[PDB]
Amino acid sequence: SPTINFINFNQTGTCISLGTSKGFKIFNCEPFGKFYSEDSGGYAIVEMLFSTSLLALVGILRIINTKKHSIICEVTFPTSILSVKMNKSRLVVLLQEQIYIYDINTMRLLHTIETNPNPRGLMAMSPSVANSYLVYPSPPKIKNGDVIVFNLETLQPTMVIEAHKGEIAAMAISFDGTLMATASDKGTIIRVFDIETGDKIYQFRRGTYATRIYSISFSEDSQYLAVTGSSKTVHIFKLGHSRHFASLKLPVETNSHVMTISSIGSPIDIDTSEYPELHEPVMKMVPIRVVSSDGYLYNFVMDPERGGDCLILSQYSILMD
Amino acid sequence: SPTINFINFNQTGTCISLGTSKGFKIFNCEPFGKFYSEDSGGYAIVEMLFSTSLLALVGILRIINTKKHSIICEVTFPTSILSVKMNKSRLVVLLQEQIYIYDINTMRLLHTIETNPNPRGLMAMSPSVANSYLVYPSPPKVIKNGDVIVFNLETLQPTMVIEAHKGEIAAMAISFDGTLMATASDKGTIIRVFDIETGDKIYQFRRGTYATRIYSISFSEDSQYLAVTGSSKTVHIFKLGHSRHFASLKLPVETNSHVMTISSIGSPIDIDTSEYPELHEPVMKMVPIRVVSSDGYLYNFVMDPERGGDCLILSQYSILM
Amino acid sequence: SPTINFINFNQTGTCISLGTSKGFKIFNCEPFGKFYSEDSGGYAIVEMLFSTSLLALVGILRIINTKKHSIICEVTFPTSILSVKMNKSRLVVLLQEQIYIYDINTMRLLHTIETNPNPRGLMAMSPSVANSYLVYPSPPKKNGDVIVFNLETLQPTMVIEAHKGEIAAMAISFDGTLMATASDKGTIIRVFDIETGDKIYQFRRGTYATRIYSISFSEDSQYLAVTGSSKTVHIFKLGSRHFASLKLPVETNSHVMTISSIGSPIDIDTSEYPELFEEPVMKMVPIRVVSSDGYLYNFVMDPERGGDCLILSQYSILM
């Protein structure tokens, strides 16, 4: 089993990107299958658009169309790339002290921001062109958790958010580009700010003792927020409005030193006759897909009313098949 | 009489720097005199610190100590320099699209800012190290055209973004202590001053009757008054002790209308009313105002802080003679 | 996640020395971070001085400087190296039946002690050069005899009858004034004055058979920390019954070896931790526990109440 270095959903949560030490793979979610693969070499960053056969590959920057098996262009940078995010309008490249913004269509350089160092390569980017926003942390050279709200459409900053007292650990933007959620390096407080005005809307407490946070992600309908940390547990905070609404516990066999990213899908019908949820024949269950760095996928279901600990239905392997 | 290309006061308003097409000159204000001069060549930027025998010289960037007649350093830039400002802590050089910040002591480069093009070379520098702030305009790259970026020089991180005006910014000025910032649109009809730490607009002034260009803005030492000069050959004084201009400075009629005019406001001094029939106690405090124009003349005025109104002119010298 | 083979603090308790089957890493405690790492190979003992970019490497003996990336010297021994400890004056290598003493500056050999076998590789060093001592057990070839060896003049000073049974763990305070030992049954702690040899303190611990692994003093010697196999760490005050206790979370791997070290009191912010531990700042003595499974745990104790201590954080070494 080759070592994997990168896992990410697409901007809609219906696909899986992945990168190994020997190549990269592309899966699907509902009719699970391996759409694409390539045994080139070590890949560190594999980012995909809303399907559409467009990929960004960073070896351990090249953009490739997988349907045509051709290369659009290759871009070199003085320093190593730390993060890459896309929407159907702009292409963003982050280095440890520089942010590069490209037009996804014409691929010409548009802007460059000289920022204070970001060793963690943190970003959050709105995927919708109607509200194309970019946010990145602004540490000083107590004013540690300042985040710069940058508008990609006009290429100008909009406001400065005094998010947290300590360094920012993770940040995400809803699908429509309306909200933003950030967490400090202690991972004890989750705060949600409205990117339009900047006022803090929601503040959530995560866990008891300070533990690291890996990734934050909204639902497609912005109903729930998902956080994943070193506790081998995934919390879900309900944004329909403190304490997490419902929590996800991986099986005890899973190694505790695994990176976990998750995503929440649209509610769908499941059969209660087959599954003793403990009864109407069918009720709508919110699906959550959790993939771990060891190479497994987990499917949970969440009751929007009951919440609580979520049942697990199935489990796959992303390596091999 | 050689043509002059650049005039400005020092950060305290008690000295004069000037640049001709044949050299530069340095004057003094109260015991008027010519401290220094060199007929080297064309000079476009001659900026001085708080006396201290330190100068920035740009040919038609070199740092020269006038007392020692030596060269501290010499630095080149890819494009022409548009503005240079200093405090006793930082040195700022602005090109049309780039801002360079240098430490005044070590002279090593500290930061670089990539901004949207500023053909007008507009900035504002706080001269006090306690509140060292730099503000530069951020127009959209091709209504929100008058966006200005509040940048902190101490920590080298921006603090907030101020939506100053609807149209492009034409002039900026920061008080001596770095507390307030004043901005002027390209129409020169509305003068707005913002409190830099909070960001709220404190005062709003109407200037003149019809729209006309504004040359420069400058605060008093005690932030009591604000001086603006425009193409109407009239200088207005706005009282910040708290609309309409408090007092107006009318130059003599024989003066050419196409003259760049910069001004400064000094601390109140005792003047003898026996010599000057102000229209009476022997002495009364009157604020002295020095207005040097691009034709090469200095004009001394006095304002009565209670009466205000049209100001009397005491004397006129002639720079370059 | 490669397996680790050595985990230990520095002489001040403000760093983490850790060596894996693939390399070694050097961490920090309050501003947690990865100071250094090399993927060279299997390392059995990685010991560090008071920062100062000095390391000792034992393969699964070489002294390296991490700042200059150079090798000072390499020395071989007839048997496997069991333990290495350092201070600002002396370097000591312990083997199965021999103890080697080196000058940390010159690297010249100074003295060699012929001791009865030590299968556990037990020794303790005073880290201060003012009272540079070395203590090691002396089993008969009268079981818990500890030889107080003066590294300053290279001569033993006195012999203490510590315990009737085998000695399990020994430690010397930072100032080199006190010595603490624990028997093989791990129920009684004895603290001796290294100058005179009088028994000063006696502590009770381990109601059932839980072996004692490590003993450590605080910087001010106010507290004594003992870690055993029971997944619970006791704190004794040197001002009988234990003063405070540490309970690791149950989810942790039980097949682990845990050490600990107590630091100087610091201030913690209440606003950072909304759920647990909720005066914006309080003085709480920090306790750092690292286990072989690869996790660093931080606990805090109230200097007056004591009791069971909260856990502020749990960071992940090797990542």
Numbering used by the authors:
A (entry chain C): 5 to 64, 75 to 155, 222 to 321, 409 to 445, 458 to 500
B (entry chain A): 5 to 64, 75 to 156, 222 to 321, 409 to 445, 458 to 499
C (entry chain D): 5 to 64, 75 to 155, 223 to 320, 409 to 447, 459 to 499
Paper text:
The corresponding primary structure contains a series of conserved WD40 repeats forming the 6 or 7 blades of a β-propeller fold.
Interestingly, once dialyzed into the low-salt buffer (100 mM KCl), Atg18 formed large supramolecular structures when imaged in negatively stained EM samples. Using cryo-EM of vitrified Atg18, we identified helical tubes of 260 Å diameter including a diamond-shape repeat pattern along the helix. We acquired cryo-EM micrographs of wildtype Atg18 (Atg18-WT) and subjected them to segmented helical image processing. The assemblies exhibited a pitch of ~100 Å with 5.1 helical units per turn. D Fourier shell correlation threshold at 0.143 indicates resolutions of 3.8 and 3.3 Å for the 3D structures of Atg18-WT and Atg18-PR72AA, respectively. Interestingly, the lipid binding sites appear buried in the T-interface of the helical tube suggesting a stabilizing role of the involved residues. In line with the highest affinity, we found that PI3,5P2 binding leads to disassembly of the helical tubes.
